[PDB]
């Protein structure tokens, strides 16, 4: 273990609220995360309108710092249903404000999800996003 960071984002997942229920009842509501070609989702809730992660998520940057172009994934949908197109809500989180040369860390609550029409769903999810720019010895 060297002491020395090589850029990792971590998404932590406190809890969603105002689910778009279903016929049924409540739906299986589950977070999906992509950034650096990783997905990695929470653990999908049971019969649950505010289904409540709070857990932490961490990707590897490698030394790979943050830009304008870099944004972070979150899909939330109904585990139950895979290859149907039923989708809850989604929402995009524009890391371009947390780039810099100074670990940032801000707290994004209050998204509104939008269907894959990209219609208000009137669902909305906290989440807290925190940069860390890399340096070294080990620089790629």
């Known amino acids: 273990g060297s002491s020395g960071s090589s850029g990792m984002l971590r998404v932590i997942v406190e809890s969603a609220s105002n689910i778009p229920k279903?016929?049924?009842?409540?739906?299986?509501?589950?977070?999906?995360?992509?950034?650096?070609?990783?997905?990695?989702?929470?653990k999908k809730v049971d019969n649950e309108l505010n289904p409540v992660w709070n857990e932490?998520?961490?990707?590897?940057?490698r030394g790979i710092p943050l830009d304008f172009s870099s944004s972070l994934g979150i899909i939330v949908k109904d585990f139950e249903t895979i290859g149907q197109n039923k989708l809850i809500g989604?929402?995009?989180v524009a890391l371009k404000?947390?780039?810099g040369d100074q670990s940032r860390?801000?707290?994004?609550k209050l998204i509104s999800l939008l269907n894959e029409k990209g219609q208000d769903?009137?669902?909305?999810?906290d989440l807290v996003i925190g940069y860390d720019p890399p340096?070294?010895?080990?620089?790629g």
Not at 121 to 125: E, P, R
Request: no cysteine.
């Open 22 to 42: 279903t016929k049924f009842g409540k739906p299986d509501p589950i977070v999906s995360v992509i950034f650096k070609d990783e997905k990695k989702k929470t």
């Open 56 to 61: 932490i998520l961490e990707f590897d940057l």
């Open 90 to 92: 989604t929402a995009t």
């Open 97 to 99: 404000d947390l780039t």
């Open 105 to 108: 860390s801000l707290p994004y």
């Open 121 to 125: 769903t009137g669902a909305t999810i």
């Open 135 to 139: 340096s070294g010895p080990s620089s």
